[PDB]
Amino acid sequence: SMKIDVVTIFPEYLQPGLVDVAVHDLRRWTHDVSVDDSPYGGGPGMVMKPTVWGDALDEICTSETLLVVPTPAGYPFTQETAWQWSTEDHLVIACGRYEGIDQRVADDAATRMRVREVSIGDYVLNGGEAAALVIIEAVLRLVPGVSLLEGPSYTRPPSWRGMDVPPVLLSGDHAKIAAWRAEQSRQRTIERRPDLLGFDS
């Protein structure tokens, strides 16, 4: 059983019994009627003010909440992270936009609850929303009650456009197939992700 609350200024993006997922429009906690301002010390782009975030998260979080903050400067979100989070009761995902969220939101929250700044990969997005969907998919499929690269998979027909299924897969020989697949996985891994086997990227 898990509850996930996503907090965003772009709730429209997210519209698509063991688990519930709620999307909250951060603008509902605004004081006047602008969440962003210019960065201290200068620099391009705008920064989300901590004030609106503080009120929102106050209402939504408890001290047992795991606060997840997507950021391109975060710790790596990996399958190990996903296993770790799959047994949590309550995740709140704070989605930023502009050039991100004032650092004091995460620093303050970390005095009241567990906080995790994470990145889903080494590319730049426009905000936390797409990252939130990745994190949610990766975690929810591991919730109770739901190393190497995988080799190639095949199905019918056995011959297609003159291209044949590797004959070993039609042999019915379990041990030869397990061997052949173990081989394919290791060959794909060394070619595409040599770092996984301890070699230079």
Ligand X SMILES: N#Cc1c(-c2ccc3ccn(Cc4ccc(CN5CCCCC5)cc4)c3c2)n[nH]c1N
- What are the residues binding ligand X (CB under 6 A)? 44-45, 70-72, 74, 96-97, 99-100, 119-121, 123-128, 131, 150
122 is in an annotated binding site: yes
Give me the least distance between CB of 118 and ligand X, in Å please.
6
Contact 93, 7 (CB under 8 A): yes
Integer CA distances (angstroms), 138 to 123, 142, 176, in order: 18, 7, 32
Q: Is 53 exposed, middle or buried (0-12, 13-18, 19+ CB in 10 A)?
A: buried
Residue 11 near which of a second copy, ligand X, none (CB within 5-8 Å, type-dependent): none
Give me the least distance between CB of 4 and a second copy, in Å please.
15
Give the length of the chain. 201
124 is in an annotated binding site: yes
Residue 28 near which of ligand X, a second copy, none (CB within 5-8 Å, type-dependent): none
CA distance 193 to 196: 6
87 binds a second copy (CB under 8 A): no
Integer CA distances (angstroms), 81 to 20, 56, 72, 90, 187, in order: 20, 25, 16, 15, 26
Give the sign of the dihedral formed by CA 128, CA 131, CA 132, CA 135.
negative
From the list 121, 117, 134, the residue with the least C-alpha distance to 14 is: 134
Q: Which of residues 96-115 bind a second copy (CB under 8 A)?
A: 99-104, 107-108
Our CB check for ligand X shows the closer of 65 and 71 to be 71
C-beta neighbour count of 93 within 10 angstroms: 26
Give me the least distance between CB of 147 and a second copy, in Å please.
9
Q: Which of residues 118-157 bind a second copy (CB under 8 A)?
A: 120-126, 129-131, 133-134, 137-138, 141, 149-157
Contact 46, 98 (CB under 8 A): yes
Give me the least distance between CB of 143 and ligand X, in Å please.
16
Residue 128 near which of ligand X, a second copy, none (CB within 5-8 Å, type-dependent): ligand X
Q: Which of residues 8-47 bind a second copy (CB under 8 A)?
A: 10, 12-16, 36-47
Q: Which residues are annotated as a binding site for S-adenosyl-L-methionine?
A: 70, 96, 119-125
